[model samples]
Target: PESAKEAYAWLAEKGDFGHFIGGAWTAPGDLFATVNPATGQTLAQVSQATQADVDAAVKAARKAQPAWAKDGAARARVLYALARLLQKHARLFAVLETLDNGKPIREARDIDVPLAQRHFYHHAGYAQLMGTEMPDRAPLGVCGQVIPWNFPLLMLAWKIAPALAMGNTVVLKPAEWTPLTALLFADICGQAGVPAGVVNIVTGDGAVGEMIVTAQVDKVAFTGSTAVGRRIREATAGTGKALSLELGGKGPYVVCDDADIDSAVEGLVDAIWFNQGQVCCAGSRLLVQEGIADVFHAKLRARMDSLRIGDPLDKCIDIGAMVHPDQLARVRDMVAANTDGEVYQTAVPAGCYYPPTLISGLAPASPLMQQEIFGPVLVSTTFRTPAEAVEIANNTAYGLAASVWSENVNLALDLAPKLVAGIVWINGTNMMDAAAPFGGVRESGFGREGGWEGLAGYTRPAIATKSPAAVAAYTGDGAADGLDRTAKLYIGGKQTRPDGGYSRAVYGPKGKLLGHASLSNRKDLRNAVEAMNAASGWSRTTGHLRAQILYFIGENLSARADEFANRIKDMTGKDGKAEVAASIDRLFSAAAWADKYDGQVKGVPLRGVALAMKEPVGKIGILCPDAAPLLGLVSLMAPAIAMGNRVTLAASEAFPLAATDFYQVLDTSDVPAGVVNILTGAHADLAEPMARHLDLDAVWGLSGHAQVIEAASAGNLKRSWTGPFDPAHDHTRDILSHATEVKTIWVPYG
Candidate 1:
């Protein structure tokens, strides 16, 4: 309670706080206690934002965004002013952050404050360069940003700087647990010369996040848990709101045999114990090589025993009080419920702190190994080989990050690409920069948060295109009677009849009869999905193996290139040779990228490691575009399977015999069963069901039915992209990005 009294008193002098809108504060609403987590002391009463408050913030942001969009030099100057002011009051912001969020003043002063200021400075440059560097991209107006309590000001900067730099206004909500720094930021807006409506700060809980997400905002950017991210995805489905989620992750920290044990031990202290282990991308799982597992953990236990757990304001403390008591209970209870491991904990202050914990001797499948404890807890397992290390690292559903600790450069680099994470650190951890993009894949959530990629999320193509109606054009009642030449649906690596026993007439672009396509109903889709599920091994197989199969498919297609190319000419009247040539190149291009698209190692401030690994996005259901029939089919199929995702592709609606004929190529290419199933039918009949399928992890409707597929994807809240893309050109790089999710892993190393 005695900590940072000078800063706390200064804030207390302002009395109770409320929403900051139009460069002014609203009258305090029915307020809730905003307490200091380090001590159970009520610091101030902060307002719970009503929908009316959220509406005002959005209106303010909307009012300022256009003007912000117009003057690049002016916007640049405003961002520069923010950075300058943040620099001037760094210690004040740091102490306030420590008092509010319960993170150590050291981290607040060192990592969080500096990074937040760096973000504003970095974006000032982007704002100055916007008209030149990003000439074709325009900002999405009035971004609704929701950040977590872990690093309030830092997370706020991550969202706001990019949005503001791109000339978008922002209505941001600070995490309920930590609103003081954001309020301080609001107070400084005038000093920074920021316009009244340019940036508005609202404080509240999840309900307020819901209000902001569903409000009349042009975009929503969130950094929180994956479960909440899924809910947001479902809620925003069918809405045109541009959304990006930076969600939770249980990072795996791997220690290879060659690692320096002493350096690795201290790194472990920084990896999990820092910030009381509340970081979303915390290195929670420790995977050590069998040769050094016991010694490494022994050193880790001894180092953790030496860690000081007390007041966050203490100048010499190693660990700090947790964000809240409820969160502390969550961390403690998670360890309590799991009996499969040997638990070890360091002593802590009795009131609000949790002891640094280690759960060793656990199986890979143990709950402590799989779930995020989100406290000063570490669960560890031992691996026998590099291959086994990768298998264990990639076992979990969370693919946020991985850390590879091998002193050997080749070994580190090799293992870096294999682990399923967004960021990878070799011999280090939590290294972040304003220039590098950050975020995770899979259940860890969507979208990057920094660098050019992050800036792209808050902006879009300057030209807007209309989305198609959700309605499908086909009638469900059709019979496949006596059609001997009807194209059969390819399921589970076999040519098969559709579940509906029906066919749709396929007419050429010039109205010539091509052939009848089997109308694949939901039952056939379910079968294809089941087969894709059964082929999970395909995902685990080496990229080199997948590359071989892709090459084989290309070779076999070349054998009958003339026949398939002729089919394309008959159906669409395009250049068959070029289509076939491009399709072959697409296959080769995918094969080229099979093992080449590498992950990143973050040089974070921590003493350990951070790795960003790219992994597959499970099963994908892609609806092929009618344009460039054969080329389109190959373009979508190559990348999906290249990244080790099994796929069910609804072949070209107009020219599908080319696809049906390739069933032989798939059969000969050693493309494993259920890996690349093909189905023929009207694109309208297939898009919704596949999008709605619970087993399919992602759906890409490039056939002008994006709105329908995107709306239907709410059934599972799976990833959906229905944007414009041309398959005739090279999209191997872009498709590869869509093919995999980034997982970030943090480890300790020397």
Candidate 2:
């Protein structure tokens, strides 16, 4: 198993591998040659899946889902067996992985294989707990997962283990560049006693991945580049299929002046040079302190010179070949066009092998610095101070992972919370475990891949929601005269008429005309968003300030407790007391949690700290639920605002006066204008536009048009949470956490 000949012999003896579906291998389809990047040789001819193949896989997964989900102990035993199988065949899997993907043999054995096993083991426990710990959540059946070529086996483990643990069957496709281990995994499913059809693997290029993505699957989980992730998001838009993306990243590695220079240099080696620097969370952009830039670079260069560049099969080698020639060319072309930096590369073999590349003296604006090399390339710049380091670190559109080096624990901890990343390794690089969650934000993509947070994406509330029928109120008619006041759309902290001089007659439970509510259109939403963008400072304000404002909103809400209760009674013939009291309690809960909801300090195995810091999600757009108007609006609003986010909320179409009456409370609470703009319009009219708006960071909908919002949100791949939720249940903490991001900062010290 340790020899290259043994690896090749195993592949040759098995002959051409076929697609695995319904617990067995199918006849080979049109063939594609799987190449060895190390030697540029055809390793095997694997099948390319057609739509039929994808459909069959999905069907098998669907058929097996119910039975698999019915038995938690049985699922746990399957996972535990899978984990044990992986360990028993660890060396063989490692050798096969190294042969399939162009990573070093040692790395395959030590990093990928063990971690893959670790995931299965970790998720066995998850499966055991799901029956009790997560009773309210159910598996999102038939998850379609597409993993990248970078860490093929490990990626499969990340997607598949969690899925199976949650009792969800998965139809997965490995990247076109790598499919060997996944096929091998499929081969062992029977031996592991994973029920027939519980795990289905299709082999093909991007087309097969696309088919699995758009197919009749309950969830789509992808781990690849940001560009493809965007396409997947667009393709699945409006489908109500759950999605969690672990995409590309250009993670920064910051070196402070007070860092342990020697240890920092070695950590830098592990950061950008390990895995041939193809890691999605690779620390490719180096930001060093100006005071010690020369020394650090010299030490780093000496370390780079020592990285052995040779055959991946050689256990002594430090750098391996690129995954493919196209990736090799992409890296070379990026470096060739860059005249702004000093390029450094070690001597290496021909073919797909690319050397450890270090580009120093590059400006932050240099194309080399901005774009992801996705190879053994590291670009660097110098910062004069810690603040400058932060400013430089955040210049990129991607916020995936980062690293910082320092001797002072306090300083490292301070800076670890500042850099925008999801996985931050202090003093160390690429430190991953099944217990620690990994993912990113902004253009880097959404959702975590491991830990409890990741499982959130693979499961959903057991309660089903039927879509609301289109509103019959937009007949462009309202009472020409009303009782004293005509309700207008609230924008920028003030009431204004809809852009189309229109209002709709809102009726009571008795069919009596209660008031004239504004019928806002697209232009009104645009203005509200504009107002929300202007209040971006709200996100920068301290949580204490936000808490004070939230308390005032609650205080003012209490002043009209009876009035709100009566409005609830008139709108839906429901008792108003509970709704009013619940709304007030929610507001108070949000206020109580505003300054107290602390970000977690991730424990690392090194001397530094990786801080998963919570930051506002910026401007959010929420369509209040139809179930409880007052409670829904506040439950959604209070948490978002409490997290220091500005929101443009669409009040209930069925009960607009309850929200309209709260304008006075907002005004009295000294809540910043534009921070919580209330618009009374058909959610069908506003949900899509609000989601389509590029400036909005997140969209939350409980208006029963979840499909529309999810589809429209692909425009910028904005974060979205849309589904049926009970407003009576206090979900302030849940909404508050979802209203922000976890920005991990890696602070390394002695």
Candidate 3:
């Protein structure tokens, strides 16, 4: 009765490790007690697995491998189901995690639990990735997972969700010290109807893990201490096991002198103290620039002092006890060892608590400075120059991530590249997303684990050679020769040559030859001259033609709505119906832009004074990509023609049909002969000539060809390379931003 009269009672039964093999919870091991660090009291008992238990789990995993691999979508469905189940029972998981791991209940409930469920949901949808083909082969097969005690349930989900979704069976090894929630996860898998052995949770010490690692698993995913990760790597080497080691970090947080003081202070506290400083990517090293160092440290100290350290199960708690006694001792030893440095501690009265700490005036070579102090400790240092800050940040062996806080965008961007980390957060710190490719540089480990690139890593690339029929449909020369080379010419005052070229000259509206000038030797210069020559005439013609043609094209696109949308949906992973309607709307905008201001406006009236005239540059070239086939072509073609320039577009080889469809729309509209020419050919062959061709005035480098743009300046020096356009800018302003004029006006009233 006395034992039961404690402040809080255990809501769940004591952990009994019952291995989930063949979709059922069945014990194959003895039970062991898990104790709380705050008081040496037994919290729960979990199943302690042996070598025999490990074998059983592995065997079950091996058996389930084929079916899971073959039914990747089905696996995804199960994962989605599990994600739903986790969401439904989120509070239960959160409470259990806090009870077992000594992390605050709020963190478990808010960040860890929700993120765990999201991880499953995200990867479940991502499961379709397993069915994808690669350059050489099929699914990677069985996965061996090892999760740490710090984030027991969440880490389990992180490893298992992706592996299961990717059509790989798993032999999961939860940390022996904390295995309760992992055992509960086995129950969740059962509820989701995941096949037995598809996910087998085996609990034991290093021996059990070693047994699992040595087993015939295709890949090994481990999230824990760096020392054990290195050992895992060593053991798995030469066996060709795909290893994803989410290891330790000594992440740097640099606050430039120009950084927003308030935001930087908050970021500094969050960087190291969040999650009890147990995060692998925590900004453990705080590098403050010289003059602001003292001020920043004071702000940081004040913020750190406000953090609450109490029972992890308390919903109001900000900081919690260490996971266990050994961890608490390790954190203490690490802090005590920093005696040589200026150690500043905001002490907590009692309990297994390490206060938010700052160690300043230490050499960069100090152990506390170089190694990861994975507790609520921040190692502080000062730097005079930006270069010195960068050096200090990069001096670490780990490069998982780093943060730079500065008001100057140029300085932030410049320092970001030099930080020697996989991810560099600017202005803000520790902000992560599923869309971003998260990983590290140097010893932080290789390979990415999020976004399209992350999914791509799990799948291999396969080149399926097309049949003759498949090849013929796209490769034929049916419409290849249809582009009209010569239509309107005599730009400036020069005669249009038969070879579809013109020399630089001055001209009037009636095609009158005013004066002749030889073509500039520099390609960009010639392009600029041509642009000046054609500006007035093309601007005049384009004002009338563009609106009509764009309207017609928009109408046509709408008429074939279903087909266009379907094609987009099939090619890219977007909802076709919505994108198609959006595309039509964008076309309407294009039409409106073309109609409103295709020509120039003079600031003042002139009788004999020089006036400005806008004209189209001759022969524009565009390099288009295959991604977003229809939209990519539209973005390139619409703007060029709207500006009154004749364009030669090189269709992307990956999606030639989209380009062809675009031209088809143009052909049906009232677009003139040489104003829009679509070329179907290899970019490798066509890009160089288009870039260097004396006939072409400007090149729009929309394609992935950096070399083409580099080589483009060879012909005429006045080459105008169009860069990325920001859609947020005022279209009218952007269109007229670079325009210059030359003209003469007569006063009719006089």
Please, what are the lDDT tens digits per residue for candidate 1 over residues 212-266? 9999998988888767877787777667788787666667888999987787777
lDDT, each prediction: 0.81, 0.83, 0.61
Q: Rank the candidates by TM-score, best first.
A: 2, 1, 3
Give candidate 3 misplaced runs (Cα > 4 Å). 1-15, 129-137, 275-278, 456-750
- For model 3, residues 653-717, the per-residue Cα lDDT tens digits are 44444444555566667565555555543455555666666555456654545444534533342
What's the TM-score of each model vs. the native?
0.85, 0.92, 0.60
What lDDT does candidate 2 reach at residue 431?
78
C-alpha lDDT (0 to 100) for residue 278 of candidate 2: 28
Clashing pairs in 2: 237-711, 238-711, 406-748, 406-749, 416-745, 427-748
Which candidate wins on lDDT?
A: 2
Better of 1 and 3 by TM-score: 1
Per-prediction RMSD in angstroms? Answer: 4.5, 3.0, 18.1
Task: Compute the lDDT of residue 611 as modeled in candidate 1.
Answer: 53
Task: Give one digit per residue, the lDDT tens place, for model 2 in 1-750.
Answer: 158776677788767877888898888779889998887789899999999999999999999999999888899999999999999988878888888888889889888999999889988988899979988789889999998888889999999999999999999999899899998888789999999999999999898899999999999999887788888988887687888887777678889999889987887786554534224465688999999999999989989888887788888877877888888888878877778878788775367777788889988666767776757888899999999898989887778888888888787778876777777777767778776778877777888777776787888766654434433332323345545657988899898989988877777766666778888889999999999988988988998999999999999999989999998788777789998999999999999989987876655454555555678888998888666778889989999999989998999887788999999999999989899999997887888898888878889887866667776777677899875556867667668768888665555444
Query: Candidate 2: where are CA atoms >4 Å away?
Result: 275-280, 465-471, 474-479, 482-484, 492-548, 568-578, 592-615, 625-627, 682-685, 704-708, 726-734, 743-750
